[PDB]
Amino acid sequence: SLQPPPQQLIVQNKTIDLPAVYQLNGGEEANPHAVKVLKELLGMLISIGEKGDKSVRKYSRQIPDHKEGYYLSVNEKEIVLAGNDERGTYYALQTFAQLLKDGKLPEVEIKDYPSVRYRGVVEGFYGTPWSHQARLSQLKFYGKNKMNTYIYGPKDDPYHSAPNWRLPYPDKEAAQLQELVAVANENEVDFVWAIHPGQDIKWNKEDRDLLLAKFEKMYQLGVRSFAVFFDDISGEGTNPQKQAELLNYIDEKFAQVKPDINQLVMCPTEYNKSWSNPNGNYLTTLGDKLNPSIQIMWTGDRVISDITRDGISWINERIKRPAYIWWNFPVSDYVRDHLLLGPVYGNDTTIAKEMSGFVTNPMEHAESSKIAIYSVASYAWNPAKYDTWQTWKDAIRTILPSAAEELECFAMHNSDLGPNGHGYRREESMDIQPAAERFLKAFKEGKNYDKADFETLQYTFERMKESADILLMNTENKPLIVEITPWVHQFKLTAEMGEEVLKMVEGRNESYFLRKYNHVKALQQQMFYIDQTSNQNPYQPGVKTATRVIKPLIDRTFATVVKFFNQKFNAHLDATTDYMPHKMNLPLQVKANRVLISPVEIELDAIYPGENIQINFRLSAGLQKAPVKFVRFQFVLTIEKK
Ligand SMILES: CC1=N[C@@H]2[C@@H](O)[C@H](O)[C@@H](CO)O[C@@H]2S1
Ligand SMILES: [Ca+2]
Numbered sequence: 001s002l003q004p005p006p007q008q009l010i011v012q013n014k015t016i017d018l019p020a021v022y023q024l025n026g027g028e029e030a031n032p033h034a035v036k037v038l039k040e041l042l043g044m045l046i047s048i049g050e051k052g053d054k055s056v057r058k059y060s061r062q063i064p065d066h067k068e069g070y071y072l073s074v075n076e077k078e079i080v081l082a083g084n085d086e087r088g089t090y091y092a093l094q095t096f097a098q099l100l101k102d103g104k105l106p107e108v109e110i111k112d113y114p115s116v117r118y119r120g121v122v123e124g125f126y127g128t129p130w131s132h133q134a135r136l137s138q139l140k141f142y143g144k145n146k147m148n149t150y151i152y153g154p155k156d157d158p159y160h161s162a163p164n165w166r167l168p169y170p171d172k173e174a175a176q177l178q179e180l181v182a183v184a185n186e187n188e189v190d191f192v193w194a195i196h197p198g199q200d201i202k203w204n205k206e207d208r209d210l211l212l213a214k215f216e217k218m219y220q221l222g223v224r225s226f227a228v229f230f231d232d233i234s235g236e237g238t239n240p241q242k243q244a245e246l247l248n249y250i251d252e253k254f255a256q257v258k259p260d261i262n263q264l265v266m267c268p269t270e271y272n273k274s275w276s277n278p279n280g281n282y283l284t285t286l287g288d289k290l291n292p293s294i295q296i297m298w299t300g301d302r303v304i305s306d307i308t309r310d311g312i313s314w315i316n317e318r319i320k321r322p323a324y325i326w327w328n329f330p331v332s333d334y335v336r337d338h339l340l341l342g343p344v345y346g347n348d349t350t351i352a353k354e355m356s357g358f359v360t361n362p363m364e365h366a367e368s369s370k371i372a373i374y375s376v377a378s379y380a381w382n383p384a385k386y387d388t389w390q391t392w393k394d395a396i397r398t399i400l401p402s403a404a405e406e407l408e409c410f411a412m413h414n415s416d417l418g419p420n421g422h423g424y425r426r427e428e429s430m431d432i433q434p435a436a437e438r439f440l441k442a443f444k445e446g447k448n449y450d451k452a453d454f455e456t457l458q459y460t461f462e463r464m465k466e467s468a469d470i471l472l473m474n475t476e477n478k479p480l481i482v483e484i485t486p487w488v489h490q491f492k493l494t495a496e497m498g499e500e501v502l503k504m505v506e507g508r509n510e511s512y513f514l515r516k517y518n519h520v521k522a523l524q525q526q527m528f529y530i531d532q533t534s535n536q537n538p539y540q541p542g543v544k545t546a547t548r549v550i551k552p553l554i555d556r557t558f559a560t561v562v563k564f565f566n567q568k569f570n571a572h573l574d575a576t577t578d579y580m581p582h583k584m585n586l587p588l589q590v591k592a593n594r595v596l597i598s599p600v601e602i603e604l605d606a607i608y609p610g611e612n613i614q615i616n617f618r619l620s621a622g623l624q625k626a627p628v629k630f631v632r633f634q635f636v637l638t639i640e641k642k
Helices: 032-041 054-059 086-099 132-144 171-186 205-220 240-255 282-289 309-319 367-381 388-399 401-412 433-445 451-473 478-505 510-533 550-568
Strands: 008-017 022-025 044-050 070-074 078-083 104-112 118-123 149-152 190-195 225-229 264-267 295-298 323-327 355-360 588-591 594-597 601-615 619-622 627-632 635-639
Touching: 032 044, 032 078, 032 086, 044 054, 044 086, 054 078, 070 086, 078 086, 086 104, 086 132, 118 132, 118 367, 132 149, 132 171, 132 367, 132 478, 149 355, 171 190, 190 205, 190 264, 205 225, 205 240, 225 240, 240 264, 240 282, 282 309, 295 309, 309 323, 355 367, 367 388, 367 478, 388 401, 401 451, 401 478, 433 451, 433 550, 451 478, 478 510, 478 550, 510 550, 594 601, 627 635
Parallel strands: 022 044, 044 078, 118 149, 118 355, 149 190, 190 225, 225 264, 264 295, 295 323, 323 355
Antiparallel strands: 008 104, 070 078, 070 104, 588 594, 594 635, 601 619, 601 627, 601 635
């Protein structure tokens, strides 16, 4: 499965062998980055070059007349790799590398080019910025998948955002950035350095010069594309006239003055329809006043959304140019306890002409995001032929060949975001969703359930456990495994709980049932400890997994079978589904050093120093470290733990 799929492919159902002896025509005059790839890969004539080179004159009418276009031919007599331009030749080679299987090439002719001009990744999330090593890995991944754009803009980099956007990077970070630009250039990626000055920018000469001064420093490190972001700010930095004037100044005094600057992009304050005032002048001001070479970014009809024909028509009409899409998936920075490892879908596949670019905002988990990134690369290059599920499967097998089926199992049940303030959800566990939904309907109402449905759930829990143990021990992609490990532990526990809960449904005798029930309570407690010890970030601490379909099913099944046990044996077993050490009909929650009522008396499991209490029917009272176990009366106690 060539990824991205070429615009045009004719296959001959013959194969040849990579020539053991070959003649290379055009090596000294073709893109040096393309020649190095070809030489790594390896008489029969092999012709490599860009349109205009002597080496490729015979094929000049086969070469697509598109930026980043190429002609690739393999037959009995010869191999041709001909770009419309240097980047096209590199890309011919990336397709060539995928065709070569076990010293053998199929007989093929390809004519190819991208449908969207700018394709790639914006590292533009809140959270821990990617590591240097992660970024190096990403850049190489982008070259293989024909992504030409990497926008550097981590919200939490103090040299990118306020107030230290004014300061040059220190030497060590500066040397790192320089290395990234070198590696980007080698993989035919535009490194686009972004700045986020809007929260404390003064519209004066001092701050304008400081911004230009910073861009000059980045230029000296080798940066040749630049962005200015005005997202998620308030105050005087939201002024569109001043924003347009600053960007026009950067364009006129810097972008159009240097010998070799490429992209100049801006992200607006009104960056989606819901955040834009239909009766305000903001977007029209930018559209009218911004120099026509400046790109304007857009996230769709909401902060988190997929791109539709109508939504993009709306923005394009106002900004008077095709929108440069900032797509907010798989970014998880607002559901930080979830991994979003499902397929890329929901974006209109017929609107390439209406966009100047398409970039993905990924997770803080660099390797994990490669599933979506590979898929966005495929989509943006050939939207017409974009295949959601095949691409997801191809991504997984690329990322983890040694355990592709195991990663598919884990990813397929780690796709949804759960409820959230952005209203954005994805499908999860759809394969088993109907079996789950039947089983539980039947079971809850005392009608007999189908054996096949019970077996399906059983098979699922078994395969999850296998997948988890195998993924833990995988050494093919260590950085991926480090990223997901906490979720994998939680995924195994979920599967073990499901297995035990189903043995309870098969309920042999009272004694066996009680063993199973006690095993389940222990598993709940183990899940709570992971949720409190792993991924303890300030915003959505912990680890959630298989949340849309599997966890609800296991929970409701458990509560149901305990209710029936209590009726049959006149018993009083606790049917609660999440473990909670503190006692309070709403469920308590524990988040860091807070104990919380999910929106009279609370008894903690020990005496703690009390920090404060926040109630809300903004009530507040510090407890000055006063010992506290009981608390009688949002509703949030904070304690020293801490
Ligand atoms: C433009 C946008 N700027 C923000 C990004 O930095 C976040 O990562 C994203 C998800 O929370 O939300 C908005 S979209
Ligand atoms: Ca050339």
